Ligand binder design. Structure first.
Ligand code: HEM
Ligand code: HEM
Ligand code: HEM
Ligand SMILES: CC(=O)N[C@@H]1[C@@H](O)[C@H](O)[C@@H](CO)O[C@H]1O
Ligand SMILES: CC(=O)N[C@@H]1[C@@H](O)[C@H](O)[C@@H](CO)O[C@H]1O
Ligand SMILES: CC(=O)N[C@@H]1[C@@H](O)[C@H](O)[C@@H](CO)O[C@H]1O
Ligand SMILES: CC(=O)N[C@@H]1[C@@H](O)[C@H](O)[C@@H](CO)O[C@H]1O
Ligand SMILES: CC(=O)N[C@@H]1[C@@H](O)[C@H](O)[C@@H](CO)O[C@H]1O
Ligand SMILES: CC(=O)N[C@@H]1[C@@H](O)[C@H](O)[C@@H](CO)O[C@H]1O
Ligand SMILES: CC(=O)N[C@@H]1[C@@H](O)[C@H](O)[C@@H](CO)O[C@H]1O
Ligand SMILES: CC(=O)N[C@@H]1[C@@H](O)[C@H](O)[C@@H](CO)O[C@H]1O
Ligand SMILES: [Cl-]
Ligand SMILES: [Cl-]
Ligand SMILES: [Cl-]
Lengths: 701, 701, 150, 151, 50
């Protein structure tokens, strides 16, 4: 660049302020251009006069405000994030050249966001939905994102259908009803006309659609990807994030109650858990398969509507992630984060999964919408941990200052920088070299993709009877909300290709004719770890206990408080509830509901709070408590029991149980005198692990 | 914020990469998300196959490219910038609380951009136009911008008319013709129907419309502003940047030649001067007036079409600016810079100038257009030198991370930070407290604004006869390009209200009837420092000398080279020109024109190059030089002489002069033998200061 | 504009399609630039092959989809609208020159939107909140908006 | 065709329209509209100045009476890729060796110009490469040009 | 012109940055008469025809 005076360029770097995190301590307010200000009164022509155009303080403040909002994500708008770390279990170089997997105990920084799918930005956490599980590894060789969900299969087999699925499940276009729900004609029409959807539709109707929290679901990559070794050999892999807390879910009416009582239930759960030191963990696992396995198992590994059963190919544990810090600013870090499945690193490659292939286009393009311009990767949360060097330039919102004035390749002026990186130098990305294609250029679906029903059948067989009833109840609920009889009937006919018992039970729920067995795709096969009831949690850290006490019986508070040490030691929060705040009280009846607690304990001597609605109704007007709605304590109890949660009662607390028709002989009901509270606590710990007592759920066939 | 556990917030700051200037030395290419790549071949299904959608390397690179461009400025699109420093001459606290003016020798970092007005981004530097002179002081109390031009008055008296003036002067909307020029019906229609425009129109037609360079014009704030002292007393001020190089300008046909030979003439001049250590300087000056002076001088200080004559109120020197560094990346630093007249600091205030008042709205709003979002002040060149603290949040392209979670006032949670700043604490901005308004709410112009013609008359009287002829030639040129006779006649009638001699000469140029004296607004008054010919430069640093030599007479190169030391010592570049590069040659006939040099020297013994076009025409086809167009050397000489530039000839070089009809007796013609080259050089230095020899320009009345 | 040939301008208005309400009945699917298409399978290098960059049908559809969203209102994001009509009870010219109020029984078209304030686009209708009551009169002398609350 | 220059233009021009128009509805601008009305299930986006009436904006559906209908080679005059087109190969980031002759056609072009225009080419190259400030680049250009035509 | 300068779309930003004005100072306008363009045309010899 310097064989002459003209092309020789003097660089003078200016001492520009380079703040990242903003710290207000000690400061006076300034404009964005650094002039010290107050911001509390408009400049006016006299104190009762009109506001002046020259009040630039007013205009800069309101212009910022008027422009705060950005487009939400077209899908997964409602979500929450956290930072963490990932530790490799091994040097995996034998199967992948990926750097974050290259050594035992190698640690990589992480950022993840969890979300629903269909609802808009402020929709209810406990909507029935798919849930996103999207994690970025900030590796030494680039940001690697696994952008997954809590179900193993997806609804469709080609990315070109994605706007069809999404418009179908989103609110109707004429009136934007209903919010965050598939319970409408268009969605079930789509799922029944596009029968690839059945597998994921069953997942959605199961407890998987309504998880207890982000900490109590698994994550799946869904698609086949490739691990590529340094020498070019590849393996076909499928990812699972196995929650180290375990898998647990709500029941529908409980998910509804939670939506109305605490729309922030899952984001609050994640925030509180991290803030309280109960850091959620998920183990990265992969089914590591050979190229020869593409069609071996009787379905196609390119097909995203199909899971590989653990019993056919086991999951190999790769390493452990932990999320251990909350974001500092939600808008800056969470709202602006843009995950992309095309954010790959050397040692990872794609497959010809037609669903995956289109996602690679879509996510890069969509980042423009939400960020207003092309420099979205420059936002701090999206930056790689090492500095970027390439010949990309300019664009709205450019906050870097390139010094390489020869921004093209090949050139003879820049000393070869930046250098081309590839398989054999600079740890460059490379497509797996044995990949091959051969064929006409076709817009045709592979016939290997044609079985839409067998895997739905396996999934059904994989659920305990209580959760099978839950699926029926959900399908019946959603298809009763569907307004079109012909769609209802199409759904039944589709379900009958999956399992006759399922379809008959649904048709009965809908008041429709019962179909007859259609055995073509039926199977008795089943797989494990795809249900959400009947298997206990692996950790009860960060779960909640509600201890129902009264200010009118002061010893009840003290009884609550003496149990607190035991729960604290298990990482369980004990919440003492009374009518109103007082010494030792944590929360109140008026603020409380069953959904707020994972187990409930009734204190000794407070039985009189637990009047049934019928009793409440006699004495109305005067001398009924104003401090909470009529029969609130009773309702918390009855709801907790109905939902399947452990309930305990100390002393005369058992009177409350009887009032509620709860026999002390039921599973997950613990009783004891005031002298045995220590043992009652440990039984509650026991019940928290079991989590739900499914013997309480009504069964049909 | 911490009287409870719930409102107590844990802040974990993540180790995010915070590069500003990008340095490629040593690096491999990576994506924007940090994955090492090559970028030279698309991924294809076979080497002659179609490109694959999964080639994310291709897509990220072209998406960046496809999005490089941003909207240009609606006015002043064509411009160039540089960094520098400003030194106060004094502590000015007696008249202003402005911090950058608070101490003798106090230095403040600066960034300025100079521009034309009407042309779009890649229009020719030497268009006849207004020129911007916009400078930012990066003060300790915020970014203070003086957004001025090279003319003292502006065309209109109310900001609401700004889109009218601009649409009128910009290219016609049906076909976008003509570029960067007022030489069309709409502009002259506007200037004649909106007769406020006459003052600035005369400036535009003078040499002020076609400056030699950004270094050889002055800057004006145009509007009255206020200096406000700590105690609230204000002064009314008008700013001038007095160029320390002096004021110099082109003639029209020369400005045209330059437009076709070097569209980058002014930006190149500024870049080269700085790169060569010839740093341009401008002295900040202010007419410092009393509040009582608003109507005293027979016009209104709120009126932007009126200058205050130096002879009525002298300019007080405030300090000295120097520009001493080129930008590192033009797009990042120059294109993205957004100056605003509303970028004020404590100790500065506005006046009720209706033109100024609207600019305060317009420039803040327009920043959205060019930056795609509200965070334009976050771009490095626009950042204040001290960190920003306020409760503005979010918006596209947010690259900071706020830690104050209580982003509102008043609050009891944030420890009073950030603190309100005002007149009496924190050095807060304050409106000048004696400012007052009183009146109906009116959309009416002040009658004090009604004299549109007297100041145009003063301006005319302020120009030497040669520059008066230049104004006539320009008006005649532009109004001959105007296609509408009735507009031509309106212009004449308007000009006749200014000066009868002016109007008669223009009407003669246009073939129109000569108007008769209309003495209402006539005056003999004149003012100084508003012309561009007849006054020498104050510095000749960074000017150019062309030394015309030949490869066919090798001693001519050596003669050139032996003069170089003397020019270098004056900071003048000597360029030796021959047919083709060779030992000691700097540039070539084919690359050269008169516009490239400020003075021309013809070498001894090369007279045979200087054949006139007539001589060239005899011998055509064979044995005519292919190395430059016919009579190129002659044309350089004839053009240089016509334009008024100093010309010298050594030895038989005088033969070239005679061929060109240039007598050695003319002013600004230097001749000498080969033994007197040292003295010839010093005479050329002399001529460079005089700059133009106006005795060569044809005069009328 | 026409005292001369140069400033005289010929206007040729082109027969450009000017649809407002879109009616699909009877139609084949087309791109946004009018080429008839199907939109149900990606173009691939073989039926089990990778998707091709040249599949412009795929890209135009997903680019539209990828760009469907716009920023919600900074306040009153959650809301719903309807059209209607307004009838003046009288000629109110004695107190206002407003045209939509200038005659007994004078009718003006209306559009209103009602909303909460604090919640984002898909938040619950029955949040405790201020409620917007924003109505546009499409008058003969311009759109008059009363942007009020409950 | 599989012209690797053409293939990328297909991506680039659709994407770039976003930059210049501020949003995705650039085809709705009058000069870009087709002469017959558009019908598809694309929706929304900044600057939407149409008003869709089909409330069932997805395929397949049973609610919209089959409209809008899928168009293809055999019905509705639908676009179709040429059916004999074929690909076969590893997935490669490699240039075809058939592309390696960079100089023969430049030579043909030179021979295709009258002597006066050949001089014009020389004058232009000389003008531009005199403006080039780097001697080594000037020399590289000469060496390249010498592979085309020595004169 | 009948031919184009390059043989692969991925090189398009290289050709364009090379021929456009230099990034430090945005000089020169509308011209290939500068080091970067002729550097590109000579290092990327596909460019010779165009
Ligand atoms: C296996 C199937 C899929 C999974 C597991 C998946 C996963 C996700 C997740 C987790 C998010 C939220 C990321 C975040 O938290 O910010 C997301 C967003 C998104 N997905 Fe998908 N997705 C799938 C299929 C598709 C398909 C086929 C497309 C389109 C071709 C698509 C387009 C999008 C878009 C446009 C976004 C918005 C991203 C943004 O604005 O940053 N998805 N997806
Ligand atoms: C005294 C009269 C005026 C002067 C001295 C002046 C000066 C300037 C200058 C120097 C620039 C270029 C700044 C740069 O280099 O980036 C500029 C741009 C601009 N001016 Fe003015 N101006 C005047 C009148 C007005 C008026 C009345 C308006 C409108 C109300 C206006 C609106 C603008 C706008 C919108 C820009 C574009 C700024 C940007 O995009 O950053 N100007 N003006
Ligand atoms: C008397 C007090 C106010 C009332 C009655 C009121 C009413 C409303 C209503 C009804 C809307 C929703 C309109 C719609 O449905 O689209 C709205 C939106 C808005 N309001 Fe207010 N408002 C008040 C105070 C303010 C103030 C003081 C400001 C700011 C200075 C403000 C700024 C906004 C903004 C920025 C929007 C978003 C409008 C849009 O994006 O279209 N409001 N307001
Ligand atoms: C594709 C591959 O592995 N080979 C290349 C090699 O031919 C080239 O010299 C170098 C720089 O581009 O990068 C490596
Ligand atoms: C999962 C399914 O639908 N059918 C499978 C069948 O393909 C397989 O041969 C058998 C043994 O694993 O298990 C069952
Ligand atoms: C918040 C929670 O779960 N339990 C709290 C406990 O931490 C606190 O020490 C106590 C004070 O009485 O109130 C209860
Ligand atoms: C306007 C003024 O000079 N007075 C205020 C004072 O009343 C106030 O307590 C303080 C903080 O806002 O700022 C100063
Ligand atoms: C500038 C102008 O138009 N007229 C002025 C006049 O107002 C003033 O009284 C006189 C003395 O300075 O100079 C002349
Ligand atoms: C660029 C300029 O103005 N003059 C140059 C001079 O600096 C250089 O030393 C000489 C080499 O012969 O060429 C001439
Ligand atoms: C690709 C092709 O030519 N065949 C199809 C046909 O199978 C289909 O029924 C119809 C509607 O999609 O369009 C035609
Ligand atoms: C154009 C070129 O470089 N060479 C061609 C050669 O390939 C061809 O065989 C011959 C006959 O047309 O003409 C010459
Ligand atoms: Cl594959
Ligand atoms: Cl004033
Ligand atoms: Cl082909």
């Amino acid at each position: 660049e310097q064989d002459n005076a003209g092309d020789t360029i003097e660089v003078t770097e200016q001492p520009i302020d380079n703040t990242l995190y903003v710290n207000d301590t000690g400061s006076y307010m300034t404009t964005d251009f650094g002039t010290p200000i107050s911001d509390q009164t408009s400049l006016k022509a006299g104190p009762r006069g009109p506001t002046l155009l020259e009040d630039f303080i007013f205009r800069q403040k309101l212009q910022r405000f008027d422009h705060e909002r950005v487009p939400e994500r077209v899908v997964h708008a409602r979500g929450a994030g956290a930072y963490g770390t990932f530790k490799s279990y091994a040097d995996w170089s034998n199967v992948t050249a990926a750097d974050f997997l290259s050594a035992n105990d190698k640690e990589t920084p992480m950022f993840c966001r969890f979300s629903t799918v269909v609802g808009f930005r402020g929709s209810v956490d406990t909507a029935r939905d798919v849930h996103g599980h999207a994690c970025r590894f900030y590796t030494d060789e680039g940001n690697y994102d696994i952008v997954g969900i809590n179900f193993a299969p997806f609804f469709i087999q080609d990315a070109i259908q994605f706007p069809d699925l999404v418009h179908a499940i989103k609110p109707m276009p004429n009136n934007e009803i209903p919010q965050a729900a598939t319970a409408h004609t268009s969605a079930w029409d789509f799922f029944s006309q596009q029968s690839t959807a059945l597998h994921s539709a069953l997942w959605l109707m199961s407890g998987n659609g309504i998880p207890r929290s982000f900490r109590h679901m698994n994550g799946y990559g869904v698609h086949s990807f490739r691990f590529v070794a340094a020498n070019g050999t590849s393996k076909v892999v499928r990812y699972r994030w196995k929650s180290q807390q375990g898998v647990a879910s709500l029941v529908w009416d409980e998910a509804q109650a939670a939506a109305g009582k605490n729309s922030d239930y899952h984001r609050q759960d994640l925030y509180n858990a991290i803030a309280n030191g109960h850091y959620p963990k998920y183990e990265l696992q992969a089914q590591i398969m050979d190229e020869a396995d593409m069609l071996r198992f009787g379905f196609d590994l390119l097909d995203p509507t199909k899971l590989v059963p653990e019993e056919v190919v086991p999951y190999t544990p790769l390493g452990m992630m932990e999320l251990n810090a909350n974001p500092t600013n939600y808008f800056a870090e969470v709202e602006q984060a843009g995950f992309q499945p095309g954010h790959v690193v050397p040692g990872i490659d794609f497959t010809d999964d037609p669903l995956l292939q289109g996602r690679l286009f879509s996510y890069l393009d969509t980042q423009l919408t939400r960020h207003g311009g092309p420099n979205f990767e420059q936002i701090p949360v999206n930056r790689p941990r090492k500095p970027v060097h390439n010949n990309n330039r300019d664009g709205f919102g450019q906050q870097q200052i390139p010094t390489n004035n020869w921004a093209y390749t090949p050139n003879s002026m820049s000393n070869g920088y930046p250098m081309q990186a590839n398989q054999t130098q600079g740890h460059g990305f490379f497509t797996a070299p044995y990949r091959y294609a051969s064929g006409h250029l076709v817009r045709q679906t592979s016939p290997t993709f044609n079985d839409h029903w067998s895997q739905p059948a396996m999934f059904w067989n994989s659920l305990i009877p209580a959760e099978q009833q839950m699926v029926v109840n959900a399908i019946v609920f959603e298809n009763s909300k569907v307004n079109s009889p012909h769609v209802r009937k199409n759904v039944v006919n589709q379900l009958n290709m999956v399992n006759n018992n399922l379809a008959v039970r649904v048709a009965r729920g809908l008041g429709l004719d019962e179909p007859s067995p259609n055995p073509t795709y039926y199977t008795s096969n089943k797989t494990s770890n795809v249900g959400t009831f009947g298997k206990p949690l692996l950790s009860i850290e960060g779960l909640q206990v509600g201890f129902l006490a009264s200010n009118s019986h002061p010893e009840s508070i003290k009884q609550g408080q003496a149990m607190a040490a035991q729960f604290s030691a298990a990482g369980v929060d004990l919440n003492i509830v009374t009518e109103a705040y007082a010494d030792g009280v944590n929360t109140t009846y008026a603020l409380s509901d069953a959904i707020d607690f994972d187990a409930l304990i009734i204190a000794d001597g407070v039985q009189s709070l637990f009047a049934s609605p019928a009793l409440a109704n006699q004495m109305n007007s005067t001398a009924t408590s104003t401090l909470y709605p009529p029969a609130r304590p009773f309702q918390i109890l009855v709801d907790s029991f109905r939902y399947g949660k452990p309930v305990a009662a100390v002393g005369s607390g058992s009177v409350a149980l009887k009032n509620a028709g709860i026999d002390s002989s039921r599973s997950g009901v613990y009783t004891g005198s005031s002298e045995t509270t220590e043992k009652i606590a440990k039984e509650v710990l026991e019940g928290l692990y079991t989590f739900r007592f499914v013997d309480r759920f009504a069964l049909d066939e």
